[PDB]
Amino acid sequence: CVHHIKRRDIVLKWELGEGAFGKVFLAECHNLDKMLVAVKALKEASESARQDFQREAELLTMLQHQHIVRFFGVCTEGRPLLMVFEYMRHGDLNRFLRSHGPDAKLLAGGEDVAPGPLGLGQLLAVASQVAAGMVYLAGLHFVHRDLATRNCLVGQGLVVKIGDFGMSRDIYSTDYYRVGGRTMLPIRWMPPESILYRKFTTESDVWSFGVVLWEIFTYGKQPWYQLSNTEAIDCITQGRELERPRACPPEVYAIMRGCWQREPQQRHSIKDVHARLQALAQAHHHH
Numbered sequence: 001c002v003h004h005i006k007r008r009d010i011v012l013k014w015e016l017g018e019g020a021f022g023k024v025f026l027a028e029c030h031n032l033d034k035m036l037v038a039v040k041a042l043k044e045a046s047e048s049a050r051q052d053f054q055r056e057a058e059l060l061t062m063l064q065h066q067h068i069v070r071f072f073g074v075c076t077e078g079r080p081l082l083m084v085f086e087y088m089r090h091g092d093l094n095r096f097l098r099s100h101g102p103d104a105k106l107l108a109g110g111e112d113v114a115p116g117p118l119g120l121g122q123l124l125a126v127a128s129q130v131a132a133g134m135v136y137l138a139g140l141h142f143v144h145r146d147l148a149t150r151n152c153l154v155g156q157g158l159v160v161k162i163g164d165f166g167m168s169r170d171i172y173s174t175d176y177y178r179v180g181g182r183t184m185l186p187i188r189w190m191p192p193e194s195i196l197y198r199k200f201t202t203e204s205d206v207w208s209f210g211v212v213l214w215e216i217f218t219y220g221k222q223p224w225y226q227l228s229n230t231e232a233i234d235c236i237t238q239g240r241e242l243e244r245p246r247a248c249p250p251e252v253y254a255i256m257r258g259c260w261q262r263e264p265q266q267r268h269s270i271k272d273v274h275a276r277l278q279a280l281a282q283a284h285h286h287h
């Protein structure tokens with residue numbers, strides 16, 4: 001089951017950032033010799049969060065693929081609680097897309113090594129890699145339920161992995177709609193059946209992948225940024241389609257549309273989506 005780790009073996013360097021979960025730190029783990037790792041700490045860690053911690057750790061232990069952030073274990077001595085991960089140096093995929101879009105170079109400075117917007121090849125490589133993670137999850141009849149670029153990570157070499165299972169959801173982010181009470185839904189990434197009746201399936205994940213493609217080729221824009229969430233619920237539910245992004249080739253748009261068929265069983269399978277993206281990333285390798 002869940003590998004445990006001794007607090008003494010975890011040395012915190014510095015905060016990488018904060019979230020709903022809590023802080024994430026760069027750290028040095030020992031005995032895995034001497035190693036660089038990401039450590040997510042728990043903000044509250046009282047009761048509900050203490051057993052949602054149980055869940056995530058068990059889940060992350062379960063999953064093992066080159067496109068899922070690797071998990072090493074936890075540390076339950078004292079407080080607050082910690083999860084330990086491999087280190088992805090370029091952070092979340094959403095911020096990475098936006099900062100490396102058509103004003104990466106046109107707005108750089110000192111701490112700016114090798115700017116220039118991301119090209120077609122790089123975008124496809126990001127897309128194919130997120131697909132692969134998802135092919136894997138579909139294979140285990142696993143349903144993510146919150147696939148979006150904010151829950152992917154980027155590591156050195158444009159290595160992109162799925163890194164979070166939306167276990168902690170930002171109460172204050174427009175990316176989420178409070179259905180009622182404490183339940184937050186990422187409605188802009190969800191299809192009609194999920195928005196109306198919370199039917200989550202591998203076919204609702206493929207829809208969300210479609211939307212991830214859209215985020216990728218708009219360089220990180222929020223789907224339906226023009227709309228508030230209630231307006232967006234009405235469009236999505238009425239059958240409205242996001243526009244082909246400026247940077248998006250027609251063939252990539254046709255894939256998005258295959259992920260967005262209205263009837264779930266008519267959506268393209270993630271496996272076929274993955275293959276078709278890989279073919280496209282192949283055919284552009286040398287241009």
Ligand SMILES: CN1CCN(c2ccc(C(=O)Nc3n[nH]c4ccc(Cc5cc(F)cc(F)c5)cc34)c(NC3CCOCC3)c2)CC1
Pocket residue numbers: 016017018019024025038040069085086087088089090091092093095150151152153162163164
């Ligand atoms: C250009 N800059 C470069 C530096 N930078 C970074 C870099 C790395 C992280 C970070 O925590 N990385 C993680 N590595 N492994 C994780 C596992 C797990 C996690 C948790 C997680 C998973 C995920 F899929 C998305 C996340 F935002 C956070 C992180 C790492 C990092 N952390 C913040 C990213 C934004 O959210 C707050 C923390 C920032 C910012 C951009």
